[model samples]
Target: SVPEEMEASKYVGQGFQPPAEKDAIEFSKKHKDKIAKRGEQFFMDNFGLKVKATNVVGSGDGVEVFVHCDDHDIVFNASIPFDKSIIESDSSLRSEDKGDDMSTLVGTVLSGFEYRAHKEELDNLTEVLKEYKSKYKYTGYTENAIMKTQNSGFRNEYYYLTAIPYTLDEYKRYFQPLIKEDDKSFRDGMRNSKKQLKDKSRPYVVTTLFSTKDNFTKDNTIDEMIDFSEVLKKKKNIPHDLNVSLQISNKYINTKRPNYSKKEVIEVGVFNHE
Candidate 1:
């Protein structure tokens, strides 16, 4: 059901009207089959997944589709603008690539929406991660951060991290100079970055780090975090034979709502290397 707070009356249209809070929820439930079929077919045709879109929730901007699979659940949202037909009819733009294939079309559609809805949060995380680059011997990590709406009032942040053996060249380029000079400026920068990360208002900050140790098994980690893992592998070409660590942290800031304030590390999971 949609929340009563959402003004459903605002969205009234032919194809898919953006409904009010509760109305949107209800509408999504009512049309679950149709939406699921559409989403399922898209996934099957594109990625060979026989998934079902379970439910949808949203306001006017877009709707989040909850997809169910044999192994896990996926909550993916798409903006209305990018929901247009992939088949290009007009010839006016024939000069440019019209994204003829499903892969190209879908990639274009997904890329159309900014990966990080909150740019400031992304920037802060980037700066903080950069500060930790030398300490972690970071090769690369997930570039995009996804925001998941928990309830009508709360949202959570998630991103992935990966660290690999570094080369001497990398050390000299990134960390050796700092060590050689005992750079106070670099230390100050790191301190400021950490402070910024600790000060965000968001309730949760979750990060998954992948390790390339000999003892770790990849078994189902890739399938488990498919949405994230697939992107990391296919899009970023990050290797998958690594142990995984999940870190969950909390944030508290001044807010009118009492429940929205608190700070702590809720969970830390380091997957066995066997």
Candidate 2:
């Protein structure tokens, strides 16, 4: 299930067939301990401590090895970012001190720019939600959370800690005017109309990415996410590619973060492609 979401997003613009990942996954599992031992070595070399490594997980670019530091009372991951071609090459996971390169640091800034650059939208949206509460009973981001999801996973080079653009609450509130409860299911079942599709006046080719945090979760339901997409499609009614789905609330393993903040949320991206 975790791997499925990673596969989906990693293949976004990558239409071409690269090295087959089938054998790559097999290689990771086949030599899970091999990668994991490297992780142990990494902790020793880097942290100067003997850490107990548990296991390893492989994905697009980076593979993570789960480890525990008993001395520090800590449990976390040590990542091995490598190219897909390395799977077939001289193995030992090809894992070295490879992530500290300048390029990786540059990629890290990209995620912050993604969120910070569009704070105005988030700010405006935030206030609007506040106003609705100011006028009526105060209700806010209740269940929807924003944070790294995977306890153990890979970290692709381009996998900057992706900001989801906003909270599930902020989005629903921003589009609250047009959203209806009884019609929720009705909208979910509805399809796109020709008028919105045919309209060429809206010159700005808005490429929207509204990632839903419904990767078969417990609190939220997939059906609700389906309805929210329609809210974006039918209600806000933007003439943009509604490229939104799961992989929100997770997927960025490399980016250093603060805490598992429940209220903190990343707004979706609305790239006004010119």
Candidate 3:
């Protein structure tokens, strides 16, 4: 095989896995929901935290079960390092590239091969991206900094979290439109909600930004928090919780994430009823 072909993936989803490992990936994906359920139980038992599994990623010596709680107010993954037998046997679930065995504790709150390295590259690219978007006025979007959410019901108990992609900025150009429109929609929703309350006023939404240890720089991470929060405050007069939990890596842990940490997902802006 070519020396280049022997290398581990430059990043997860960036390159295909080896035949055996690829089979493992497909196998895992085939049973993703079942795996997700098992993962949820595992998280509950080991971490004392309840979470909903979003996906199960295989290879890289570990089967990662991505999960979220409280609508994704927190996003983390459980690392299921393959059994030694699986690794040693003809089983389709082993790390083929010895080059892929190493692990870095840094990167976004998501798992991948060479994640920290990819994150470094993404970090730099976003800088140039900002320059282009500002003058270019193009909505060139990346997964970064998109605050996506849905209240589901006009109820107070329902809340949302910020699940940023890669990192921050540039995408704010794309997000600006989305956020603004969302803000408009929610404001109208609230007005309608307030009426339905009949002065019973039993419900409203709360927002939280739960920043897992993204392993990105502090300044950039702070920018991630502030930029998103500021937009809410200024545009919609919304208020919310700004939480930066650096203790948790994107990986699963025995430690419990705070309340509803796993319940939230990316949403537009934050606020509670006044």
Candidate 4:
């Protein structure tokens, strides 16, 4: 019976037209505008005023904040500093230099940011960066390692937020990717290759919220993050979906890893309330 070989008759023709992504893109653009607008609206509705968005540039070819509005606007940029001396000391000059490649640097920075953002402690940013620099041996030859699902495959090493005016976490949650368990069947069917996937792996969401107010410090900058988490837990009821035990890290790099692609870039503009 095993060798009987049953070939079920099925029509294999391509008649289905792929959905147009243009509408989705337009929706996203409008949606992002609304998010910022809502943040402005909430700010105004609660505070009563109009806010304007402005562009900004900061240190060391550093991160730039695209917009700042009224008293609430703030800019925040994160970076990972590497010790060139340490990198140069490795076996060959090329090897040492290669080890300090752009991708690695970006991965560490992003991972560190995630760690800090999730931990609700901005200080953890420094700790994560330091920890990564001490670990990982980047030899001259590239490591054809499997990338994790979270890796964005970005070519560079930085991300900067112009401004984030929303006081509520709901707005931040808007930018996150929609991951439904119902879609697992589709995902599984799409996997034609034999490469094993991490059972817990999924895509990552990245965005930077900036404020001109510079509300952050070495100690209390991320205080808002903690409050944001609580909001997501109670108001949005998202706590059930996320792993509470896993610390949120800024960077998730899986270069060689296989994952579903869902890359998104959002730009928010806010106006100053007169």
| lDDT, each prediction | 0.31, 0.32, 0.31, 0.24
Relative to the unseen true structure, what is the Cα RMSD of model 4?
26.1
**Residue range 165-255, candidate 3, lDDT tens digits:** 2212221222212222343453454344335433332222233223333243444344444454444355321222232111111211111
Estimate the TM-score for candidate 4. 0.21
- CA displacement after TM-score superposition, residue 137 of candidate 3 (Å): 5.4
Q: Write the per-residue lDDT of candidate 2 for residues 1-274, one digit (tens) a residue.
A: 2222232233231122122356655566677765666666654543344555554545554455545433321122333344434434433322233333422322222223222333343334334433433232223211111112222211121121232222223322332222232343323322221133332221111111222332423234335434433444442322243222211233211112212232122333332332
Quote the positional error of residue 116 for candidate 3 in Å: 28
TM-score of 3: 0.28
Taking all chains together, each candidate's TM-score versus the true structure is: 0.28, 0.29, 0.28, 0.21
Q: Taking the tens digit of each residue's C-alpha lDDT, what string does model 1 give over 179-232?
A: 223235544533443354352221223353332222333442333333333333
Give the number of the best model, judged by lDDT: 2
Least accurate stretch of 10 residues (summed lDDT) in model 4?
5-14
Worst 10 residues of 2 by lDDT: 141-150
- Indicate the TM-score of model 1: 0.28
